C-alpha cells in the first residue's frame, strides 16, 4: 500500500468512535466538529432536511442535529452566575448568608 498527498480534500478514513446519548445534563459534546458545552434537551423546532445545526439572534449555537437520527436537540447553557455574600460587620457577628 502507498499513500498519496496533495490531490484533493480528504475523502476516505475510518470510524470516528460514535458514543451514546445523555439528556437533561450539563455535558460537553462534539457534533460533526461543532464543539460546545450545554444541556441536551428535546426540541420542538422544524429543521429543513439539509441543515446541520442552527443559531439565533445572539449568534450562538442553540439547536444542533445529531447525525444518527433525524431528531434535533436544543442547546442551553447549564447553571452559571456569580455568588455574593451577605454579612454584617465583623465587629457585630460572624453570621453570613450566601446568595446565588
Amino acid at each position: 500500500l502507498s499513500f498519496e498527498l496533495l490531490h484533493a480534500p480528504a475523502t476516505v478514513c475510518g470510524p470516528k468512535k460514535s458514543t451514546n446519548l445523555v439528556k437533561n445534563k450539563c455535558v460537553n459534546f462534539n457534533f460533526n466538529g461543532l464543539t460546545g458545552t450545554g444541556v441536551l434537551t428535546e426540541s420542538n423546532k422544524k429543521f429543513l432536511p439539509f441543515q446541520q445545526f442552527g443559531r439565533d439572534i445572539a449568534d450562538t449555537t442553540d439547536a444542533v442535529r445529531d447525525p444518527q437520527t433525524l431528531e434535533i436537540l436544543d442547546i442551553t447553557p447549564c447553571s452559571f452566575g456569580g455568588v455574593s455574600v451577605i454579612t454584617p460587620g465583623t465587629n457585630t457577628s460572624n453570621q453570613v448568608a450566601v446568595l446565588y
Binding site: 450562538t60 447553557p77 452559571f80 452566575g81 456569580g82
Partner: peptide, 22 residues
C-alpha cells in the same frame, strides 16, 4: 395600575447576567 400607567406600560417593549432592580 392606573389607566395612564397601563397605557405607558403597554407602549414600552454567556457571562452577561442582568441584575433585577431593587
Amino acid at each position: 395600575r392606573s389607566p395612564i400607567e397601563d397605557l405607558l406600560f403597554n407602549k414600552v417593549t454567556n457571562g452577561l447576567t442582568v441584575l433585577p432592580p431593587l
